[PDB]
Coordinates of C-alpha atoms in Angstrom, one line a residue:
Chain A
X1 CA 0.0 0.0 0.0
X2 CA 2.1 2.8 1.4
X3 CA 4.3 0.5 3.4
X4 CA 8.1 0.8 3.2
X5 CA 11.0 -0.5 5.2
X6 CA 12.9 1.9 7.4
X7 CA 15.3 -0.8 8.6
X8 CA 16.8 -3.9 7.1
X9 CA 17.6 -7.1 8.9
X10 CA 21.2 -7.6 10.1
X11 CA 21.6 -11.4 10.0
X12 CA 20.5 -13.8 7.3
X13 CA 17.2 -15.5 8.1
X14 CA 17.0 -19.3 7.9
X15 CA 15.2 -20.6 4.8
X16 CA 13.2 -22.8 7.1
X17 CA 11.7 -19.7 8.8
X18 CA 10.2 -17.9 5.8
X19 CA 6.7 -18.6 4.5
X20 CA 6.4 -16.1 1.6
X21 CA 7.4 -12.7 0.3
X22 CA 5.3 -9.8 -0.9
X23 CA 5.4 -7.5 -3.9
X24 CA 5.7 -3.7 -3.5
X25 CA 5.2 -0.5 -5.6
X26 CA 8.2 1.0 -3.8
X27 CA 8.9 3.7 -6.4
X28 CA 8.3 6.3 -3.7
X29 CA 10.0 4.4 -0.9
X30 CA 13.2 5.9 0.6
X31 CA 14.8 2.4 0.8
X32 CA 14.0 -0.4 -1.5
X33 CA 13.6 -3.9 0.0
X34 CA 11.8 -7.2 0.0
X35 CA 9.2 -8.1 2.7
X36 CA 9.3 -11.7 3.9
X37 CA 6.4 -13.3 5.7
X38 CA 7.7 -15.8 8.3
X39 CA 6.1 -19.1 9.4
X40 CA 5.3 -17.3 12.7
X41 CA 3.4 -14.7 10.7
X42 CA 5.9 -12.0 11.1
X43 CA 7.1 -9.5 8.5
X44 CA 10.8 -8.9 8.0
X45 CA 12.6 -6.5 5.7
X46 CA 15.6 -7.6 3.6
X47 CA 18.0 -5.8 1.2
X48 CA 17.7 -7.1 -2.4
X49 CA 21.4 -6.5 -3.0
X50 CA 22.5 -9.2 -0.6
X51 CA 22.9 -12.6 -2.4
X52 CA 21.2 -14.7 0.4
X53 CA 18.0 -12.7 -0.2
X54 CA 17.8 -13.7 -3.8
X55 CA 18.7 -17.3 -2.8
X56 CA 15.9 -17.4 -0.3
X57 CA 13.5 -16.0 -2.8
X58 CA 14.6 -18.7 -5.2
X59 CA 14.2 -21.5 -2.7
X60 CA 10.8 -20.2 -1.7
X61 CA 9.5 -19.7 -5.2
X62 CA 10.4 -23.2 -6.3
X63 CA 7.8 -24.7 -4.0
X64 CA 4.6 -23.5 -5.7
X65 CA 2.4 -25.3 -8.3
Chain B
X1 CA 9.7 8.3 -29.8
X2 CA 6.7 6.2 -28.8
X3 CA 7.9 2.8 -29.9
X4 CA 7.8 -0.6 -28.0
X5 CA 10.9 -1.5 -26.0
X6 CA 10.7 -5.0 -27.5
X7 CA 8.2 -7.2 -29.2
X8 CA 6.0 -9.3 -26.9
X9 CA 7.3 -8.6 -23.4
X10 CA 4.7 -6.7 -21.5
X11 CA 3.0 -8.0 -18.3
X12 CA -0.4 -9.8 -18.4
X13 CA -3.2 -10.1 -16.0
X14 CA -3.4 -13.7 -14.9
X15 CA -6.4 -15.5 -13.2
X16 CA -6.5 -16.1 -9.5
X17 CA -7.5 -19.3 -7.7
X18 CA -8.8 -20.0 -4.2
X19 CA -6.7 -23.1 -4.1
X20 CA -3.4 -21.4 -3.4
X21 CA -1.5 -22.3 -6.6
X22 CA 0.5 -20.4 -9.2
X23 CA -1.3 -17.7 -11.1
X24 CA -2.4 -19.1 -14.5
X25 CA -3.0 -17.2 -17.8
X26 CA -6.4 -17.3 -19.3
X27 CA -5.4 -19.0 -22.6
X28 CA -2.0 -19.0 -24.2
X29 CA -2.4 -15.7 -26.0
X30 CA -2.4 -12.1 -24.7
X31 CA -2.8 -8.7 -26.3
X32 CA 0.6 -7.1 -25.8
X33 CA 0.9 -3.6 -27.1
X34 CA -1.1 -3.7 -30.4
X35 CA -0.1 -7.2 -31.3
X36 CA -1.1 -10.8 -30.3
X37 CA 1.5 -12.7 -28.3
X38 CA 1.9 -16.4 -27.5
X39 CA 3.0 -17.6 -24.0
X40 CA 6.1 -19.8 -23.9
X41 CA 5.8 -23.5 -24.2
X42 CA 5.1 -24.9 -20.8
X43 CA 3.5 -21.8 -19.3
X44 CA 0.6 -22.6 -16.9
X45 CA -2.8 -21.6 -18.2
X46 CA -6.6 -22.0 -17.8
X47 CA -8.7 -23.3 -20.7
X48 CA -12.2 -21.6 -20.6
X49 CA -15.2 -21.2 -22.9
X50 CA -17.3 -18.2 -23.7
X51 CA -20.2 -19.3 -21.4
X52 CA -17.8 -19.8 -18.5
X53 CA -15.9 -16.5 -19.1
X54 CA -19.2 -14.6 -19.1
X55 CA -20.1 -16.0 -15.7
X56 CA -16.7 -15.0 -14.2
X57 CA -16.8 -12.8 -11.1
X58 CA -14.4 -12.0 -8.2
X59 CA -15.5 -15.2 -6.3
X60 CA -15.3 -18.8 -7.6
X61 CA -18.3 -20.1 -9.4
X62 CA -17.1 -22.4 -12.3
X63 CA -14.5 -25.1 -12.1
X64 CA -11.7 -23.9 -14.4
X65 CA -9.6 -26.5 -16.4
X66 CA -5.9 -26.2 -15.7
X67 CA -3.5 -26.8 -18.6
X68 CA -0.1 -26.1 -20.1
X69 CA 0.7 -24.0 -23.1
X70 CA 2.0 -25.9 -26.1
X71 CA 2.3 -24.3 -29.6
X72 CA -0.3 -21.7 -28.7
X73 CA -2.9 -24.2 -27.3
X74 CA -3.7 -24.6 -23.6
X75 CA -3.6 -28.4 -23.5
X76 CA -5.6 -29.6 -20.5
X77 CA -4.1 -32.0 -17.9
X78 CA -7.2 -33.1 -15.9
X79 CA -6.7 -30.9 -12.9
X80 CA -9.3 -28.3 -12.0
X81 CA -9.2 -25.2 -9.8
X82 CA -11.7 -22.7 -8.4
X83 CA -10.6 -19.6 -10.3
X84 CA -11.9 -16.0 -10.3
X85 CA -11.4 -12.6 -11.8
Chain C
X1 CA -2.1 -5.3 -10.0
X2 CA -1.6 -8.3 -7.6
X3 CA -2.4 -10.6 -10.5
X4 CA 0.0 -9.1 -13.0
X5 CA 2.9 -11.4 -14.0
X6 CA 5.4 -11.5 -16.8
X7 CA 5.5 -14.6 -19.1
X8 CA 8.1 -13.1 -21.4
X9 CA 11.2 -11.1 -20.9
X10 CA 12.7 -8.2 -23.0
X11 CA 16.1 -9.9 -23.5
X12 CA 17.3 -7.2 -25.8
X13 CA 17.0 -1.4 -22.0
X14 CA 18.6 2.1 -22.3
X15 CA 18.6 3.9 -19.0
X16 CA 17.4 7.1 -20.7
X17 CA 14.1 5.4 -21.7
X18 CA 12.9 4.2 -18.3
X19 CA 10.6 6.3 -16.0
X20 CA 10.2 3.8 -13.1
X21 CA 10.3 0.2 -12.1
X22 CA 8.4 -2.3 -9.8
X23 CA 10.8 -4.4 -7.9
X24 CA 9.0 -7.8 -8.0
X25 CA 5.6 -9.2 -9.1
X26 CA 3.5 -11.6 -7.1
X27 CA 4.9 -14.5 -5.1
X28 CA 2.5 -16.9 -6.8
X29 CA 3.6 -15.9 -10.3
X30 CA 5.0 -18.6 -12.6
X31 CA 7.9 -16.4 -13.6
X32 CA 9.5 -13.8 -11.3
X33 CA 10.5 -10.5 -12.9
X34 CA 10.7 -6.7 -12.6
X35 CA 8.3 -4.4 -14.6
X36 CA 9.7 -1.2 -16.0
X37 CA 7.5 1.7 -16.9
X38 CA 9.0 3.6 -19.8
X39 CA 8.8 7.3 -20.8
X40 CA 6.2 6.4 -23.5
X41 CA 4.0 4.8 -20.7
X42 CA 4.7 1.2 -21.8
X43 CA 5.5 -1.6 -19.4
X44 CA 8.4 -4.0 -20.2
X45 CA 9.4 -7.2 -18.4
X46 CA 13.0 -8.0 -17.4
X47 CA 14.7 -10.8 -15.7
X48 CA 16.1 -9.7 -12.3
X49 CA 19.1 -12.0 -12.7
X50 CA 20.6 -9.9 -15.6
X51 CA 23.0 -7.3 -14.3
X52 CA 21.8 -4.4 -16.5
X53 CA 18.4 -4.7 -14.9
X54 CA 19.9 -4.2 -11.4
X55 CA 22.0 -1.3 -12.7
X56 CA 18.9 0.3 -14.2
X57 CA 17.0 -0.1 -11.0
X58 CA 19.9 1.5 -9.1
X59 CA 20.3 4.4 -11.5
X60 CA 16.5 4.9 -11.4
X61 CA 16.4 4.9 -7.6
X62 CA 19.1 7.5 -7.4
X63 CA 16.7 10.0 -9.1
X64 CA 14.0 10.3 -6.5
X65 CA 14.6 13.5 -4.5
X66 CA 15.4 12.7 -0.9
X67 CA 15.3 15.4 1.8
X68 CA 18.3 17.2 3.3
Chain D
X1 CA -2.7 -70.2 16.4
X2 CA -4.1 -68.6 13.3
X3 CA -5.8 -65.2 13.6
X4 CA -3.0 -62.6 13.7
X5 CA -2.4 -59.4 11.7
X6 CA 0.6 -60.9 9.7
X7 CA 2.0 -57.4 9.5
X8 CA 1.6 -54.8 12.1
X9 CA -0.2 -51.7 10.7
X10 CA -0.6 -52.3 7.0
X11 CA -4.3 -52.4 5.9
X12 CA -5.8 -49.9 3.4
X13 CA -7.8 -46.9 4.4
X14 CA -10.7 -45.0 2.7
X15 CA -9.2 -41.7 1.6
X16 CA -11.1 -38.5 0.8
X17 CA -11.9 -37.5 -2.8
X18 CA -11.6 -34.2 -4.5
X19 CA -13.4 -32.6 -7.5
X20 CA -10.1 -31.0 -8.6
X21 CA -8.6 -34.2 -10.1
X22 CA -5.6 -34.6 -7.7
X23 CA -4.1 -37.3 -5.6
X24 CA -6.5 -38.9 -3.0
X25 CA -5.6 -37.6 0.5
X26 CA -6.0 -39.3 3.8
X27 CA -8.2 -37.5 6.4
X28 CA -5.7 -36.8 9.1
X29 CA -2.5 -38.8 9.6
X30 CA -4.0 -41.6 11.6
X31 CA -6.2 -44.6 10.7
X32 CA -7.8 -47.4 12.7
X33 CA -6.1 -50.5 11.2
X34 CA -7.0 -53.9 12.7
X35 CA -8.3 -52.3 16.0
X36 CA -5.1 -50.3 16.6
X37 CA -4.3 -46.7 15.7
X38 CA -1.8 -46.1 12.9
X39 CA 0.2 -43.1 11.7
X40 CA 0.8 -42.5 8.0
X41 CA 4.4 -42.3 7.0
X42 CA 6.2 -38.9 7.1
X43 CA 5.3 -37.2 3.9
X44 CA 2.0 -38.8 3.2
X45 CA -0.6 -36.4 1.7
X46 CA -3.5 -35.5 4.0
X47 CA -6.3 -33.2 4.7
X48 CA -6.5 -31.2 7.9
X49 CA -10.1 -30.8 8.8
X50 CA -12.1 -30.0 11.9
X51 CA -15.1 -31.9 13.4
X52 CA -17.7 -29.4 12.2
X53 CA -16.1 -29.2 8.8
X54 CA -15.8 -33.0 8.3
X55 CA -19.5 -33.2 9.5
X56 CA -20.4 -30.6 6.9
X57 CA -19.1 -32.8 4.1
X58 CA -21.7 -34.1 1.6
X59 CA -21.4 -35.8 -1.8
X60 CA -21.5 -32.5 -3.7
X61 CA -18.3 -30.5 -3.2
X62 CA -19.1 -27.4 -1.1
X63 CA -16.3 -26.7 1.4
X64 CA -12.6 -25.8 1.0
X65 CA -10.5 -28.5 2.6
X66 CA -7.0 -27.6 3.8
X67 CA -4.3 -29.8 2.1
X68 CA -1.3 -30.8 4.1
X69 CA 1.5 -33.3 4.5
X70 CA 1.9 -35.9 7.3
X71 CA 4.9 -35.2 9.6
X72 CA 5.3 -37.0 12.9
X73 CA 1.6 -37.8 13.1
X74 CA 0.5 -34.2 12.4
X75 CA -1.1 -33.0 9.1
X76 CA 1.1 -29.9 8.6
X77 CA -1.0 -27.6 6.4
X78 CA 0.2 -25.9 3.3
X79 CA -1.2 -23.0 1.3
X80 CA -3.2 -25.2 -1.0
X81 CA -7.0 -25.9 -0.6
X82 CA -9.3 -28.2 -2.5
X83 CA -13.0 -28.8 -3.0
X84 CA -13.2 -32.2 -1.4
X85 CA -16.1 -34.6 -0.8
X86 CA -16.9 -38.0 0.7
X87 CA -17.8 -40.8 -1.7
Chain E
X1 CA -36.6 19.7 2.2
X2 CA -33.3 18.0 1.4
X3 CA -33.7 14.6 3.1
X4 CA -35.3 12.4 0.5
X5 CA -34.4 8.9 -0.5
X6 CA -33.8 7.1 -3.8
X7 CA -35.4 3.6 -4.2
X8 CA -34.6 0.7 -1.9
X9 CA -30.9 0.2 -2.8
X10 CA -28.7 0.6 0.2
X11 CA -26.1 -1.9 1.2
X12 CA -26.4 -4.6 3.9
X13 CA -23.9 -6.4 6.1
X14 CA -23.5 -10.0 4.9
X15 CA -22.3 -13.0 6.8
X16 CA -18.8 -14.3 6.2
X17 CA -17.4 -17.8 5.6
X18 CA -13.9 -19.1 6.3
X19 CA -14.0 -21.5 3.2
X20 CA -13.7 -18.7 0.6
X21 CA -17.2 -18.6 -0.9
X22 CA -19.6 -15.7 -1.8
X23 CA -20.7 -13.5 1.1
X24 CA -24.3 -14.5 2.0
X25 CA -27.1 -12.4 3.3
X26 CA -28.6 -13.3 6.7
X27 CA -32.2 -13.9 5.5
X28 CA -33.7 -12.4 2.4
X29 CA -34.8 -9.1 3.9
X30 CA -33.0 -6.0 5.0
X31 CA -33.9 -2.7 6.7
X32 CA -32.9 -0.2 4.1
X33 CA -33.5 3.5 4.7
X34 CA -36.2 2.6 7.3
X35 CA -38.1 0.3 5.0
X36 CA -38.2 -3.5 4.7
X37 CA -36.7 -4.8 1.5
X38 CA -36.5 -8.3 -0.2
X39 CA -33.3 -9.5 -1.8
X40 CA -33.5 -10.4 -5.5
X41 CA -34.5 -13.9 -6.7
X42 CA -31.4 -16.1 -6.7
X43 CA -29.5 -14.2 -4.1
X44 CA -27.3 -16.3 -1.8
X45 CA -28.5 -16.3 1.8
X46 CA -28.3 -18.1 5.1
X47 CA -31.4 -19.7 6.7
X48 CA -31.1 -19.3 10.5
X49 CA -33.5 -19.4 13.5
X50 CA -33.8 -17.0 16.4
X51 CA -31.8 -19.3 18.7
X52 CA -29.4 -19.9 15.8
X53 CA -29.0 -16.1 15.0
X54 CA -28.3 -15.6 18.7
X55 CA -25.7 -18.4 18.6
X56 CA -23.7 -16.6 15.9
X57 CA -20.2 -15.5 16.8
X58 CA -17.1 -14.2 14.9
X59 CA -16.8 -19.4 12.8
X60 CA -18.2 -22.0 15.2
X61 CA -21.8 -22.9 14.1
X62 CA -22.9 -24.6 10.9
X63 CA -25.2 -22.2 8.9
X64 CA -27.6 -23.5 6.3
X65 CA -26.8 -22.0 2.9
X66 CA -29.7 -21.2 0.6
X67 CA -31.1 -19.2 -2.2
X68 CA -33.7 -16.4 -2.1
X69 CA -36.9 -17.2 -4.0
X70 CA -39.9 -14.9 -3.7
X71 CA -38.6 -13.5 -0.4
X72 CA -37.9 -16.9 1.2
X73 CA -34.4 -18.3 1.8
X74 CA -35.0 -21.8 0.5
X75 CA -32.3 -24.1 1.8
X76 CA -30.2 -26.3 -0.5
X77 CA -28.6 -29.2 1.6
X78 CA -25.3 -27.3 1.8
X79 CA -24.0 -25.8 5.0
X80 CA -21.0 -23.6 5.7
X81 CA -19.2 -22.3 8.9
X82 CA -20.3 -18.7 9.0
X83 CA -19.4 -15.9 11.3
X84 CA -20.2 -12.2 12.1
Chain F
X1 CA -18.5 -7.5 4.8
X2 CA -20.8 -5.0 3.2
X3 CA -22.3 -5.9 -0.2
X4 CA -25.1 -4.6 -2.4
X5 CA -28.1 -6.8 -3.2
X6 CA -29.8 -4.1 -5.3
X7 CA -28.6 -1.3 -7.6
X8 CA -30.1 2.2 -7.9
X9 CA -33.1 2.0 -10.3
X10 CA -33.0 5.6 -11.4
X11 CA -29.9 7.9 -11.6
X12 CA -28.7 10.4 -9.0
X13 CA -27.2 13.9 -9.8
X14 CA -23.5 14.3 -9.0
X15 CA -24.5 17.4 -7.0
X16 CA -26.1 15.2 -4.4
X17 CA -23.2 12.8 -3.8
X18 CA -20.3 13.4 -1.3
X19 CA -18.0 10.4 -2.0
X20 CA -17.9 6.8 -3.0
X21 CA -16.3 3.5 -1.9
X22 CA -15.5 0.1 -3.4
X23 CA -17.0 -3.3 -2.2
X24 CA -15.4 -6.6 -1.3
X25 CA -14.1 -9.3 -3.7
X26 CA -16.4 -11.9 -2.2
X27 CA -19.5 -10.0 -2.8
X28 CA -22.3 -11.6 -4.8
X29 CA -22.7 -8.4 -6.9
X30 CA -19.9 -5.9 -7.5
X31 CA -20.8 -2.2 -7.3
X32 CA -19.8 1.2 -6.0
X33 CA -21.3 2.7 -2.8
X34 CA -22.1 6.5 -3.0
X35 CA -22.6 8.6 0.2
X36 CA -25.2 11.3 -0.2
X37 CA -25.1 14.7 1.4
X38 CA -27.9 13.5 3.7
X39 CA -25.5 10.7 4.9
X40 CA -27.3 7.9 3.1
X41 CA -25.6 5.1 1.1
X42 CA -26.8 4.2 -2.4
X43 CA -25.5 1.3 -4.5
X44 CA -24.6 1.9 -8.2
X45 CA -23.5 -0.4 -10.9
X46 CA -20.0 0.6 -12.3
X47 CA -21.1 -0.6 -15.7
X48 CA -23.5 2.3 -16.2
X49 CA -21.8 5.2 -17.9
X50 CA -23.2 8.0 -15.7
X51 CA -21.8 6.1 -12.6
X52 CA -18.2 6.2 -13.9
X53 CA -18.6 9.8 -14.9
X54 CA -20.0 10.7 -11.5
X55 CA -17.2 8.9 -9.7
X56 CA -14.7 10.7 -11.9
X57 CA -16.2 14.1 -11.3
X58 CA -16.2 13.3 -7.5
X59 CA -12.6 12.2 -7.5
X60 CA -11.3 15.3 -9.2
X61 CA -12.0 17.6 -6.3

């Protein structure tokens, strides 16, 4: 909606702890990021530059229909 | 100045499903820019008829036939999904 | 918007022709991609793995006026 | 010296059907086999339903049943849902 | 002078379902702009009783799905877990 | 959880509407909900041309 991330995560989250990720129209966001939904229903912010974020998105995408 | 970046590469509105699966394309063709474009071989699709498409709302009412795009045809595979617009 | 995915990539792009981008499409999309909006108001699909796409997103981010 | 099971926990079970044309899933991860209670193997497809839901099941598909996978006797749910019925 | 109406057409709060189906109207009648109005023929509804309607929470009870015909919510075997 | 079982038979003048809202995905009938100056809610079908024009003329303000 109008939801951006003011802070990124420090550590690399465990692939086993992420349930999904969400899209964003972050054109007007000060910082660009990805938003992970965790198995415990929490939302975490991650920097798309880091490689582990792309790897997590890959391992979570290859699990759909 | 107002030319198309590249032939057949614009996004398309897929169909949604209450079954929690990949978003599937209604058919294997889409109107991209002013031209008609074919989805790649293997792209997930739905195969619907006129009567079904007219009865399509934002909540599932018809059982939509899942299929896979091969040579411009959405070849069915037996599976069905509750799909909505 | 939430049901908008890219089945086909651009493959062939110039930074001077892009007006904005959308970082990622839906999680439940068959193919994951970024969607660029061009100066001519057209939407193009690009593969986020390619380096030029990330460079375009970076040079397009460094163009939104931040405060002091 | 004649009437044993011949194999502990190994008799078939009536699964639940689905109008979506997918694999037949076991209601829960447990079945009453030869008077004992049995757990499906880790990874077996299952449905995760509640008492009121399973009771609200007819022969025409009407309710969305939560698909899941059997792990350690629990039908761990996953995103997917199916229109499922009893036949 | 300025407080008129415009034909029975104001919205009504439906009942929800955790199974992902159309939102259904509790009964086939609604109090719209101070009048009593009948839903259209074919409109999805729930068919509940006084005790049932009182036993409705935010899903725990099985509500009888039905279709509105001539102002009556005719049931059709199906039931859904519905909530307020 | 607010849906419209009936649309406005006639047609209302833009000068009598204060704003509009959109209804839910799981509603049996899809429509727009206009709020009138007298604080009443009317349902309108977005297919009708005057409805889209009224919503446009009410947004641009």
